[PDB]
Amino acid sequence: EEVEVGINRLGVLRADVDNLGQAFINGIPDDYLSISRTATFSRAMSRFFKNYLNQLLAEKSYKINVIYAGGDDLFMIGAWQDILDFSIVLKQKFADFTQNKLSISAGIGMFREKYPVARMASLTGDLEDAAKDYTKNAVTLFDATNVFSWDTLENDIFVKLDAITKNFEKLDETGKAFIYRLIDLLRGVNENQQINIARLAYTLSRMEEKIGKTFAQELYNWANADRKTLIMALEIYILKTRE
Amino acid sequence: MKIIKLYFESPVHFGEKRLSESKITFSADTLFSALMIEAVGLGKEDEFYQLASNNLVKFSDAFPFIDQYYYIPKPMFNLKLFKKLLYVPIDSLEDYLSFNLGKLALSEKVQQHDFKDSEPYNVGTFTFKENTGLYVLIEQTHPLLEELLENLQYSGIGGKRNSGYGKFKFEILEDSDIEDLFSAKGNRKILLSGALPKDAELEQALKNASYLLERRGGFVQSDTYATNLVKKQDLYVFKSGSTFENSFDGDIYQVGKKGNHPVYKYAKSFFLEVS
Amino acid sequence: MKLVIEGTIVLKTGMHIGGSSDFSAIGAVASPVVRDTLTRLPLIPGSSLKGKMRYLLAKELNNGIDQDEILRLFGSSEKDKIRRARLKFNDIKLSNLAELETFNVSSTEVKFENTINRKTAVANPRQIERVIAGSKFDFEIFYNLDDIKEVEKDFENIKQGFDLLEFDYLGGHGTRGSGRIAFENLSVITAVGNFEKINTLNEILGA
Amino acid sequence: MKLVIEGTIVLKTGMHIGGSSDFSAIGAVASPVVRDTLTRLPLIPGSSLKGKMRYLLAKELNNGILLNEPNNDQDEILRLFGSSEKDKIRRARLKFNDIKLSNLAELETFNVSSTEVKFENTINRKTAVANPRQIERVIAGSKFDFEIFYNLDDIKEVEKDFENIKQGFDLLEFDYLGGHGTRGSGRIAFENLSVITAVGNFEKINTLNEILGA
Amino acid sequence: MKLVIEGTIVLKTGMHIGGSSDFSAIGAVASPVVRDTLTRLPLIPGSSLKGKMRYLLAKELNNGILLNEPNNDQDEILRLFGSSEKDKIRRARLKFNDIKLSNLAELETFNVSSTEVKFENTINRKTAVANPRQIERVIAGSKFDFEIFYNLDDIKEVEKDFENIKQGFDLLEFDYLGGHGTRGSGRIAFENLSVITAVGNFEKINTLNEILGA
Amino acid sequence: TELKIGNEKVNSTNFGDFAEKAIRGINHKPFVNSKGGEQKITTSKIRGILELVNKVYNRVINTNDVELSENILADIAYIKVKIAYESGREPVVKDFIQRTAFTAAITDVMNQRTRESFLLFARYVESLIAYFKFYGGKD
Amino acid sequence: TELKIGNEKVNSTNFGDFAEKAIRGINHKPFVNSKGGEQKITTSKIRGILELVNKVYNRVINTNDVELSENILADIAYIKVKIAYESGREPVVKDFIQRTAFTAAITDVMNQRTRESFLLFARYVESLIAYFKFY
Numbered sequence A: 001e002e003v004e005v006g007i008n009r010l011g012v013l014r015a016d017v018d019n020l021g022q023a024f025i026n027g028i029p030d031d032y033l034s035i036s037r038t039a040t041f042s043r044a045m046s047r048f049f050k051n052y053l054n055q056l057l058a059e060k061s062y063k064i065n066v067i068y069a070g071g072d073d074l075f076m077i078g079a080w081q082d083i084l085d086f087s088i089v090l091k092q093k094f095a096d097f098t099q100n101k102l103s104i105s106a107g108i109g110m111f112r113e114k115y116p117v118a119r120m121a122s123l124t125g126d127l128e129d130a131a132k133d134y135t136k137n138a139v140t141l142f143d144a145t146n147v148f149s150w151d152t153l154e155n156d157i158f159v160k161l162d163a164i165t166k167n168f169e170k171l172d173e174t175g176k177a178f179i180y181r182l183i184d185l186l187r188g189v190n191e192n193q194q195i196n197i198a199r200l201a202y203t204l205s206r207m208e209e210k211i212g213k214t215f216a217q218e219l220y221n222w223a224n225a226d227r228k229t230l231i232m233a234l235e236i237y238i239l240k241t242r243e
Numbered sequence B: 001m002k003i004i005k006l007y008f009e010s011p012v013h014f015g016e017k018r019l020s021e022s023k024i025t026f027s028a029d030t031l032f033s034a035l036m037i038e039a040v041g042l043g044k045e046d047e048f049y050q051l052a053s054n055n056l057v058k059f060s061d062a063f064p065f066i067d068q069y070y071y072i073p074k075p076m077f078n079l080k081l082f083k084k085l086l087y088v089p090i091d092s093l094e095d096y097l098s099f100n101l102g103k104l105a106l107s108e109k110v111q112q113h114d115f116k117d118s119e120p121y122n123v124g125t126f127t128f129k130e131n132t133g134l135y136v137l138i139e140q141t142h143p144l145l146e147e148l149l150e151n152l153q154y155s156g157i158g159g160k161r162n163s164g165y166g167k168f169k170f171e172i173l174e175d176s177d178i179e180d181l182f183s184a185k186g187n188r189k190i191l192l193s194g195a196l197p198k199d200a201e202l203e204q205a206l207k208n209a210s211y212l213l214e215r216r217g218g219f220v221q222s223d224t225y226a227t228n229l230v231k232k233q234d235l236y237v238f239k240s241g242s243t244f245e246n247s248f249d250g251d252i253y254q255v256g257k258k259g260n261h262p263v264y265k266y267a268k269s270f271f272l273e274v275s
Numbered sequence C: 001m002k003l004v005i006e007g008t009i010v011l012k013t014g015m016h017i018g019g020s021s022d023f024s025a026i027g028a029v030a031s032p033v034v035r036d037t038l039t040r041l042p043l044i045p046g047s048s049l050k051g052k053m054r055y056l057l058a059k060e061l062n063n064g065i066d067q068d069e070i071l072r073l074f075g076s077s078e079k080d081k082i083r084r085a086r087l088k089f090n091d092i093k094l095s096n097l098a099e100l101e102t103f104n105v106s107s108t109e110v111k112f113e114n115t116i117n118r119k120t121a122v123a124n125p126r127q128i129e130r131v132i133a134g135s136k137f138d139f140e141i142f143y144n145l146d147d148i149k150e151v152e153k154d155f156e157n158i159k160q161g162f163d164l165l166e167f168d169y170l171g172g173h174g175t176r177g178s179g180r181i182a183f184e185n186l187s188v189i190t191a192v193g194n195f196e197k198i199n200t201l202n203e204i205l206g207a
Numbered sequence D, E: 001m002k003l004v005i006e007g008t009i010v011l012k013t014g015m016h017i018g019g020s021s022d023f024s025a026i027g028a029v030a031s032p033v034v035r036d037t038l039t040r041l042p043l044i045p046g047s048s049l050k051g052k053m054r055y056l057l058a059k060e061l062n063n064g065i066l067l068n069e070p071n072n073d074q075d076e077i078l079r080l081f082g083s084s085e086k087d088k089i090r091r092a093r094l095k096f097n098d099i100k101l102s103n104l105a106e107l108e109t110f111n112v113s114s115t116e117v118k119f120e121n122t123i124n125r126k127t128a129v130a131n132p133r134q135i136e137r138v139i140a141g142s143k144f145d146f147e148i149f150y151n152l153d154d155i156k157e158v159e160k161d162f163e164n165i166k167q168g169f170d171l172l173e174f175d176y177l178g179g180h181g182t183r184g185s186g187r188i189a190f191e192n193l194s195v196i197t198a199v200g201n202f203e204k205i206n207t208l209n210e211i212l213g214a
Numbered sequence F: 001t002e003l004k005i006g007n008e009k010v011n012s013t014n015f016g017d018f019a020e021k022a023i024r025g026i027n028h029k030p031f032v033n034s035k036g037g038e039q040k041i042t043t044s045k046i047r048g049i050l051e052l053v054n055k056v057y058n059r060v061i062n063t064n065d066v067e068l069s070e071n072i073l074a075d076i077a078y079i080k081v082k083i084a085y086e087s088g089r090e091p092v093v094k095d096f097i098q099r100t101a102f103t104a105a106i107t108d109v110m111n112q113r114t115r116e117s118f119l120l121f122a123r124y125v126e127s128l129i130a131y132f133k134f135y136g137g138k139d
Numbered sequence G: 001t002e003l004k005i006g007n008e009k010v011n012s013t014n015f016g017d018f019a020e021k022a023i024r025g026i027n028h029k030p031f032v033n034s035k036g037g038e039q040k041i042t043t044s045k046i047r048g049i050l051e052l053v054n055k056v057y058n059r060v061i062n063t064n065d066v067e068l069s070e071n072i073l074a075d076i077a078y079i080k081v082k083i084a085y086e087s088g089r090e091p092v093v094k095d096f097i098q099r100t101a102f103t104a105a106i107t108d109v110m111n112q113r114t115r116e117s118f119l120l121f122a123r124y125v126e127s128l129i130a131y132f133k134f135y
Helices: A020-025 A037-059 A080-097 A117-133 A150-160 A162-168 A177-187 A194-206 A215-225 A228-240 B028-042 B045-053 B143-149 B179-183 C046-060 C148-164 C199-206 D046-060 D104-109 D158-172 D205-212 E046-060 E075-081 E158-173 E203-212 F016-026 F043-060 F070-089 F091-099 F102-112 F115-134 G015-026 G043-061 G070-089 G091-099 G102-112 G115-133
Strands: A010-017 A064-066 A075-079 A104-111 A138-141 A147-149 B002-008 B063-066 B069-073 B087-089 B102-111 B119-128 B133-138 B168-171 B188-191 B213-216 B235-238 B271-274 C002-011 C087-089 C108-116 C123-131 C136-144 C181-192 D003-011 D115-120 D133-138 D143-150 D188-196 E002-011 E115-123 E130-138 E143-151 E188-197
Touching (some): A010 A080, A037 A064, A037 A080, A075 A080, A075 A117, A080 A104, A104 A117, A117 A138, A138 A150, A147 A150, A150 A228, A162 A228, A177 A228, A194 A215, A194 F016, A215 A228, B028 B045, B028 B143, B179 B271, C002 C199, C046 C087, C046 C148, C108 D046, C148 C181, C181 C199, D046 D158, D158 D188, D158 D205, D188 D205, E046 E158, E075 E158, E143 E158, E158 E188, E158 E203, E188 E203, F016 F091, F016 F115, F043 F070, F043 F115, F070 F091, F070 F102, F070 G015, F070 G115, F091 F102, F102 F115, G015 G091, G043 G070, G043 G091, G043 G115, G070 G091, G091 G102, G102 G115
Parallel strands (some): A104 A138
Antiparallel strands (some): A010 A075, A010 A104, A064 A075, A138 A147, B002 B168, B063 B069, B063 B133, B069 B087, B188 B271, B213 B235, C002 C136, C087 C136, C108 C123, D003 D188, D115 D133, E002 E188
16 A cells, blocks of 8 residues: 555565576586585575575665575565566676576566465466476566566566656656557457558557657557567556556 | 276366365375275175275276376386476386376365355366376276276266366276286386385385385265264375385275274285386 | 256356456456366356355245255265265356357457446446357256155256256356356256156256 | 346437447447347346446435445345445345347338447537547337346335335436437336246235336 | 426528438438438437537637637536546536437428438639539428436526526527538527426426526 | 459458558559649548448448348449449549559459458458558648 | 349349449440441430439438339439430430430339339449449
8 A cells, every 4th residue: 555656466476596407416517626616606696695685675665575585486575566676676686696697587476465375476486487488587477478588578678668658658648548549459469460550550640649750650660570578568557557 | 907098078186185286196095985985875885895805906096198198107216317207108118217188277266155255265176188188007807896987987086076077988998008018027116006015014115115105094074974074094105106126015904993984095006017 | 876967058148257367467358257277168167056056045945044955965064964965066168169150259258347436437447258148058967866765856956946047147247237047958867877767857857 | 036027128319338449440430339249239238227227226215416335325225236345245136137139120120220320529629620439329219128137035125125126217217328328328218117926926016016017 | 306308499491410321322412411220310419419509508608718628617517518527527417318300290291301402512713613512401490309307416506507508508599500500501499498307396396497488 | 361352362461561562652653643743642532432431341340141141232332333433533543443452352342242351351441541541641 | 122124134233333334335336426426425414314313312212111102203204204305305315325224224113113123223323423434
């Protein structure tokens, strides 16, 4: 009830570290071995997780509760607007902690506030397990149909959410029935294609005097080029612009 | 040696411990318990228990099978040496010296109340896809076993009855070229049921044993057992895909003493002998 | 003995039933209907059919006061009396999908509802997915017979429950135009063994 | 003991109702009337009729205003349409049904389809510039044969329940039923109202059938 | 209670209105009159009547000018016709109906049709190159029985509400209704205006009736 | 679902790009009038053609059968003769029809006489409206 | 929906195509003048033919009765006498009335006495205007 901005929904997070099993099948080789060195890696990873994650959630005042900690177990529960943008900085902090060697598979889902947490944890562990095999670095967003790699997430969606948020808040008479109609024609192009792309071109033409003579061109070329990363972008814009 | 293929029309529910889980097979004691509950249904209890006491209806536990491939769990070989693998074909094991059965689900239910709040509860399940299912293996087939199996396909193997999950249509389709593996004598034995040897032969049965204990035992249903639901004595069998040198032979233990009728637990060996 | 109750569920409207733990998109329907996890064809849980029959037996039988027959026919787990459930239900899948595509229409429709606030007249749209009317669900029920003297009484009080369900719904948002069923060509046939007086059961289901 | 409220609803104007709001053609009619997907007959839901009946009765069983939630309003309305409080929950004694078009053949004798498209527009006050909308609505004179289940349990309030459902019907006679009503659509009038038992004859169905068929 | 406003609308000329939804000959009239789709009688939609009396009332209730929005205008005019502003939604007290033709009986005594065709053209002011078109419009002297429902919920404002619905009718008397009105079509008039309570009897029904029939 | 109109076969996979290419060929190679100058087809007549199709497209939607009734085919033949008549009066719309072939498309609808063929034709025509408004067309 | 005009049937599917092939026959053997030479029917004569039909069509269209009015059949006879006057005036409208079976269609409209027969006749005539203006 503190987050009176977006949709009143509760998000949970499941995660683990990529390629960790092969990292312990063959830890350090013969020719450059002393005994003591490989323990420092694992203690650095463990102390990174516990101390660094506790400090990171402390310093930016996140509405996130934490259950596990580890490279195989990580479960946090909180507001979706606070754990969705914690995932990218989690990716960045574990990326530059590992010096871009070991990466993250993560799974984030969105839940009703009154919901059994055992059901949440099972469903989001399976959601991450959909993103886990995709191993490769990837995060899935609330469903097995939306699985994105980390750079795809960060770059593609968080500029195609930043552009949507930057443009549609400048306009007092487009948000958000036009965004709902654009979503409805965009999510249905998967089965029939030239019909929805033609209606999309026509309706981007007819809003080109309101949403912008530039903006409709990026909406058209983004819908042609990378439209799965825009339907999720408009979806999370809708979810964070609720009420 | 015989096969009983079980093609399921519906999602099934085989739990380990609770309701919200499921697994993809059911053990031998589950099948025996179900069959002699049906023999209670038709009044041939003691003859059936004596027929399983005298080892004429010794049988396996149920195993996954896809189209013309029958699988077993990976035998726990204690060699020098895939960790995400579960099953290997029974005619393809020695080369180890392409797997999709179905998808689990949580169909989620409620109990309605009139004036009280409605009570929600979730049931774990598994669905076999089209040309798949399960099968068991028996020895020296019996007409009474055929008479009792047809009463079980119309009353539900599985956990949750009568609403409305585990249901199947069985078919023998007797073996052609798999009983030779059973007759193939080998230097390294593989169990294929949740066996527990008797206390006489237990300590001689660990010369190279690579077993896994697995707790079995739950509540007890009847119209006349103990006037409320009681547990049974939990009995501690080996897991199916265990691996041995000394073959034992278990037996069927009475774990029900307090109620008027007894309660049994099938646990006897069913071996596959290889190199 | 053991008897099979056969028939079908011809649907007159609605049947929104159940509800899954899939993530509700903004998009299309939130709170979707229950469908099989592999084939994704709409089916009803046999537990919901079982529970509507149990409920509609319960509210009418011994009207004025649970009872024997509500446990004689549908199982019990009480601390004094425990009975095996005489019926046997299976989950019922959609049958006539071939001729429900001869009309070139989908198996499941999406229904668009809302409430309005009485205070502010602000609408609140919801989409609910439900199977289309005119579905036919071919169902089979087996019967755990254990006493010949009660077959006629059991069959006259399940046929009574067979017709009482036609005037009630089956699952989902019932009192706003859903779930209304009808039962076509109900019959009985012995599974195994051979029962003698199957004629009265077959006619009382055909009545 | 479990009754059927059988009658009909005729349409005297308009009535656009329902409708997937996804996207039409460029083309063509926006916001269609929802139909039965099988038989392609336009229908009213049980939800539309039940919500409109419950709204009007709670204006009259107040009397006058209604600034309330659907739950905490009355006793004689919760008895009929149901409530969902934590402990003061009352099972809905009514059951609404989906109501599909019945006199299609009588329209076919007049050789018209069961619905029309109504061209409407909007004039901006700044510019005198139109904004045409095409709205599909059913035709007037279509009859909607309907049946509402009344699951009787208590005898001392049947007469009160049926007389207030009669005043609910004749109150809905003077209001629209869904859609662009204040723009002149959706006006309905009820005919041949009757109630008939499930099996056999119950009792006092004549007093109910005279307070209903008024 | 609920107030039912009943009168009739005679036509003095023309009234071309609407546009179908039907095929036109090469031939002949394109843009025909909007008709009933069942009985093929002409109708003025209640939306069109609502739009013109709303525009004329909202025009006159300021000073004779307006450039605002429909949801952003006077409190009385929203009290009658309704709004959809995101904070206050005033539920519309008035409720129009589609008004199909009434006196087809007496117009067939003259053996005239229900509608005429108007041959009318455009002259290019440079080249004198003509361009003809045919417009279908309703025969003058046609009488439309209309019925308006008014939600009696307040007491203090009904006399205020019926002084400016009468003034709205009187303003639309001096104006056209639909179609080519500035070229001489759609001039209407009102007569036998009567108010009648739908159920029961409001006590101040007399002072409404003489503020109506004045 | 095939409709080989004048040069290609347009199923429900390759018509909107065909309409896009046809209009893009129009608004970069426009019609030269018989008077000296350049003439582009006005929005009002192409929209008139559009709702000329739509007033039977609104009747084809609410049908379940594939073979359309004689009423529908009567309206289709009427649409063909109206396309011919408006095509006859001004040559600009005449080679709009001859350039993006409605007439071959509409007579293939008159040949196949099936519901899905007319739906494919309707989506083709509205996509011509769409990409006429989009590329080059004033909005 | 029949219009068995003089030799064959044109239904409500190919009335435009029948007008198309009729006019296609006209403008490939155009009427040799009685003084020697070629002429076409002008637009005003054929437009007057269309208006002469559509005066009746406007009255017919909005009456749902399948039986044509007894007043309407009189106006169909007046169509017949008007095309008789114009056809007797000039030879080009004489064989334009002859070739496209105009009189045969109008007699069959007397014979059928149904609204849909007249409507399909008007369909046919406006398709004649359509394919005449297309060439």
